[PDB]
Amino acid sequence: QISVRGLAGVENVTELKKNFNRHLHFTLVKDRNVATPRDYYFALAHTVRDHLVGRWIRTQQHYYEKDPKRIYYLSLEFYMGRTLQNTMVNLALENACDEATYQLGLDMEELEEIEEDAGLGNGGLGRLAACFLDSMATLGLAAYGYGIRYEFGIFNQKICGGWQMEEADDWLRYGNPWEKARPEFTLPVHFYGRVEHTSQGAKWVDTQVVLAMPYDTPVPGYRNNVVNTMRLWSAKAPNDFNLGYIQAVLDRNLAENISRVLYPNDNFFEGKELRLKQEYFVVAATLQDIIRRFKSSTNFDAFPDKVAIQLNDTHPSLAIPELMRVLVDLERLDWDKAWEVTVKTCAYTNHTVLPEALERWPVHLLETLLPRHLQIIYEINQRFLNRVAAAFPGDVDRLRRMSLVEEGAVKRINMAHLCIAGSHAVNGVARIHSEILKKTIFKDFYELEPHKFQNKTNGITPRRWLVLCNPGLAEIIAERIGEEYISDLDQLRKLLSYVDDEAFIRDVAKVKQENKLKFAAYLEREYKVHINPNSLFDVQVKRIHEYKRQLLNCLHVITLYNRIKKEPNKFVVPRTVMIGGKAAPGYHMAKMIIKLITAIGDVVNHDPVVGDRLRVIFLENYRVSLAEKVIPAADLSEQISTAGTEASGTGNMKFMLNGALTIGTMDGANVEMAEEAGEENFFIFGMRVEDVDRLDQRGYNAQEYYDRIPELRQIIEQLSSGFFSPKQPDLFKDIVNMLMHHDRFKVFADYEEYVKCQERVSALYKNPREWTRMVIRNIATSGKFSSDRTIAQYAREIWGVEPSRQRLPA
Amino acid sequence: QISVRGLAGVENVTELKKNFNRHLHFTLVKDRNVATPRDYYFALAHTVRDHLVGRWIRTQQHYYEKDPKRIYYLSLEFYMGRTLQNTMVNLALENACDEATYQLGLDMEELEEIEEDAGLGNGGLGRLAACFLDSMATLGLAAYGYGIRYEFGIFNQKICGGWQMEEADDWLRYGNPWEKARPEFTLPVHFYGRVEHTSQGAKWVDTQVVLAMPYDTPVPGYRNNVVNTMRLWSAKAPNDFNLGYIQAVLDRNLAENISRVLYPNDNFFEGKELRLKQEYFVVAATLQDIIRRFKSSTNFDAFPDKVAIQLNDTHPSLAIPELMRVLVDLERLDWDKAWEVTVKTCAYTNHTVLPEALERWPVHLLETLLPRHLQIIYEINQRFLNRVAAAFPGDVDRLRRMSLVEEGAVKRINMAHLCIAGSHAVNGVARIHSEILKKTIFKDFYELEPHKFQNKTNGITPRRWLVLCNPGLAEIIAERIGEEYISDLDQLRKLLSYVDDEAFIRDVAKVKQENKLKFAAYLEREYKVHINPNSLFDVQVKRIHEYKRQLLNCLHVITLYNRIKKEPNKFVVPRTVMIGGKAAPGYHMAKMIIKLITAIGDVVNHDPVVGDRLRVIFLENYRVSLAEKVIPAADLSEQISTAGTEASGTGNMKFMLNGALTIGTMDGANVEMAEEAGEENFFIFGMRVEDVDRLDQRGYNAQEYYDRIPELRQIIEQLSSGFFSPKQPDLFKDIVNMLMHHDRFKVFADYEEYVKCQERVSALYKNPREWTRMVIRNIATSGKFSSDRTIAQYAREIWGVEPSRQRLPA
Ligand SMILES: OC[C@H]1O[C@@H](c2nc(-c3ccccc3)cs2)[C@H](O)[C@@H](O)[C@@H]1O
Ligand SMILES: OC[C@H]1O[C@@H](c2nc(-c3ccccc3)cs2)[C@H](O)[C@@H](O)[C@@H]1O
Ligand SMILES: *Cc1c(COP(=O)(O)O)cnc(C)c1O
């Protein structure tokens, strides 16, 4: 049909069709009279996977011959989403498969919708890992993702009576056709035990063994015939485990619990033992694999020339003491040499400054579970604090503040401190966030080791986030400037010369209108709900958090409702306000916010006077596959975190790429997005970081805003009095009470500037041609936000490897 | 190589080789430089499985068009063993695969040895289910095996310090290439809840849901292109199960425990709740499937014309009240009509008379777990006891003895009584066992319903138990009388005309000698142990039990040892005495017997005076794949159960087929084996059933035998004084004490006749030509013991269906 989906060669289509029917028969053991849509999806998945196999074997082969430096991306989260369409895009098979399926009387879009999301992540951090693997394969780096094959990913969100309910994400029920189990590469992981000191050094004995069994998933580069590996570990009991008989066999589940379930907290620390077991499990099995591959090329001087280990936040921080333990206790290197190797091998990406997200593990937990690692951590701290003392003699306060060990009723290990000490590079994830790291939480470490601190601004893969989810926009761009931009997103600047072209203005607005029609139809077919596709689609999708200020959006929505009621017969730009996101199951306030959003919908969507001028929709089960549908349908992106709270964000970039204008704070990557597009092409409002600091020094009094802003007072009085909860008058007292007395994120302080800026948005939407010219200015400057840029900067400035766009042979 | 392994067509071999290399590449994602023997086995398994797929789809198709009466074999056990060689035998692929593998530089025998046993059974009963599926497919019956896919089968047995240790049988670790998951046919199963009575009858409410997910394994007939289905259910939690969050997800393991592990008790009842859940789970999911298939042809009059359900012992007895519950509570049939349907549908095979094996479930358990089934069971009992009262007026004792409910401190349900009441046919498993059922434990039921009671003597599949395990013997037989005997084992009688042929005498003895060489080499390569292949191989393999009297064999072995020591320089026929079997993990005495066997080995195998004239070997981890090696290597079969304890046995038949002479009691199928071969061709000794009865009436005094038999007294004194346990003098006091004061199985009563009969065996072994002529007389009359005979009798006399040897089209 469209050109960026590749050729449908006659030979190619014939070949796909016979292999589809071979897999239906031999793989699925179905005839065509009993097959379901689900069987057809599996037959297609197996057929497309066959095109990966040759390239995967060849790539791993090439890396063995050439022996390049290897990159190990350690993450507890890989938010992959669906694999089938992404595989077709990257092998140029998409049109051939459409044609092949079409001639067997099937619709490929319908079969795509049957694939389960691999939801092995919470949000931004997990999805950054996924975008990174795609960019690493596209830039031909010998790169490996290492994590955990959770049996249950992020929970499925149902809404009942407007409340979040959680269901187990049983994503493996029907089987994963993309993974290959490698039980032959199974490795032991140790827990508990105690430390014996001998003549021959320290010895970790009386341990409990858990087996780590790897599953390999292919990661295809973009049309370069590179296929990298994502290796996820599964927990298996050894067969003598607990070995009356029956109970011993049943208790194997204790050990296999380690890989059972993803912790569903976004940007929050829960100090639970099962989580610490997850963190050690992925690190212990991974390091053993890294060292085995290295030894298959005595001498660890070359280890850092052949190995880079990137830590995705502190979650795999134990990689540092584990590498020491292997090099010191097992390889019998002296401490100083092993430490040199560790520091030149490891680099740490910090993703947050929120204090409740920083991993601070109680010592009693580490003492019981990893006794040797705690000894190594103490040894690291003593030697690190000896270097601080020498550089800053007499600064005892510095010593206490920089310690890896926090004093307190409970002693804790600050894993962030461990990561800075044990890494040659520490990066934040947007320029403003990396600056905040040097000015505030890591100021002491910066002053000791200024050379370690870098910025690597986040990005998104334009493969999944443009070609895959928005083929129509991809195509009109490819008509003007060719295909090459897909692996070189900076080429989108050429679109600035098309900003006064009537034809291109018409095409950009037509694609947006087609995406909205398609998404409005999708809402009706799966959730029986009537929306106006001529309305402005105002979209805030992201995890539910106080810092992300879904509540500020709520206040705007109630303001528009109250203005309509005051003056019913006045014209307003119609809006569909869509908010979506999961709350962590234990996060009471995040659950109340979801409930308030649906409570507002219940009132405004059934007010006859409102008409179709204002609709409030809660998008259920926001996940990667819903993001691929709603982000292309969006007109306004809501990026409204309190300045200095959102380290980067990446949703922001997805929307810029897809033809939505941004309303946002000078927070995270929003700052660089505005800088790339021009501030005049961005709906900037609210406090800067400096303004929030000034408010903090003085004291935030929310009462002051309630007394001065009648529009705001009316909303607070409505919430209190049960305007939005008639049956439970006081349902929202916790929300009012937080906004009035303990708002860490200063929602009222930004209210007035938010509403005025939202008026500036409505005014521009009234002029389609100028709205669309501003959209073109956004899409055309979005190139910086390619994860290809990000990964090339990691490779050159951290890992010491040259990216490459050269094809391997097919 | 040999003719009964089929043709190696040039096209055929080429085709196997390209498909082997396709699966190695696309299925296993290996090149030939990194593949292991295990990869090669998987590539072959997938290649051979591809030949099943067409036949499987076609067969299930044919059964839908023709709509024959369907047979449902309900068992908690299917002891399948390995599938690969059996699949090749039944599709005539064996020589083509040997040739194909040979030309790729691989040895097929080496790859076969890598397959794990599917050990989903304890012994005879589980293996009878497996032989039955093979015979049902060979006789073209529309037959289905229904059971449980246990994650862990019968434990792996290790010996440490001569003691049994148990290891988890993790048979699915590397994947099962033979099964196909059918998660689309997933069915709910209910537990707990309570019964509400309404206008519209009884209602089972507030239940806990567990999902039953079916896995299908193909069952190929012998060269008839029929492939039947074995469907095993797996337990899965529903996704709202327990649905703080983490613990809810972890607690899904409670529900999935149901299909986790096979109970490892052979011919013993353990009244545990998890076992009752296993029994209901397989019955509830199976009946729903049976009824769905039936409705896809209102009216249940025809149900028994379209459905036979065979109960494999009482383990699925709940099929009876479950079928009532479905027909009465859900289909709203009146009680009398539903009962007619149930009785004409169900038939019950009894496998034992040992009182400790009979399932007697406490009422409090059934009350809590299956409240409605208990109400239906009470209703069955009341109506059944009303028919007893009418036929035997005033016989109140009969009423108490025949009740389905046993009175006692704990009330119990006698599941055997439930099965007789609810079945149109009740069979035992050998003529003597079926006679004992009518004379003793079911005498009352026989007098009420004489027409229900049948014999169906057990059999073994000559495919696995001759062609597969003993190709050499298969071939010399096929040279004289052709191939046709393999599906018509009665044709073995033609071998009686070859009993004076020198050539055939030489060939029978040559095959036996080759099997012994091959098995002696196997002992050295896997367990570093030196045995004389010129010695008589005296073999007792079967589960470790008091009733099977491994201890009587021990007493003989110690007798031979003491005779050698008394007269060292006298000639004795050399023997390798091999005993093998697992003990139930909780069966203290069975574990002591294993320990005594190894204790005897420790003494006799290191006595210089003994030389290689007597070796005692404990065969570790006796299982189906070890039976395929040792049974063809055997000279003497030990079948020495106390008369009236072994219902049938089936090991006995395996050895008769494979050229071993039998030493045994007139117990079980031994009686019919002797009758077929002639008593003069059988080493018959010991009490008959009548003799044991006479001893019981009088009282068994073991002291009398100890006082009268000096040879026996010496052995008891050796055991007591620590001759066999120098470091623990009193290790065996429990064994001595049992033999002297509480021997239920009268080991001393048979001692003297056993030793004399063993002397008659040694004397015949001295004359190879007459030993071999007696072997030919055994093999040639073994036809009756084909499971093809057994299944044809079930089909004609119980199920009301005509077997068939007609090929389906390929
Ligand atoms: O860099 C990728 C994204 O990382 C997000 C972060 N996630 C976590 C996080 C902690 C624990 C468990 C899951 C997740 C901390 S910061 C940050 O909140 C986002 O601003 C940023 O865009
Ligand atoms: O008919 C097949 C065989 O059945 C054996 C039997 N197994 C059981 C048995 C009970 C519970 C769990 C497993 C097994 C009872 S009788 C009998 O003990 C054998 O004699 C007989 O040959
Ligand atoms: C990109 C993405 C995120 C991160 O969005 P932010 O707005 O940066 O928090 C979260 N969830 C999903 C499903 C995503 O695709």
Ligand SMILES: *Cc1c(COP(=O)(O)O)cnc(C)c1O
């Ligand atoms: C046949 C068989 C049995 C049953 O043997 P008996 O001697 O009848 O108890 C037990 N185990 C295995 C592995 C078998 O193959």
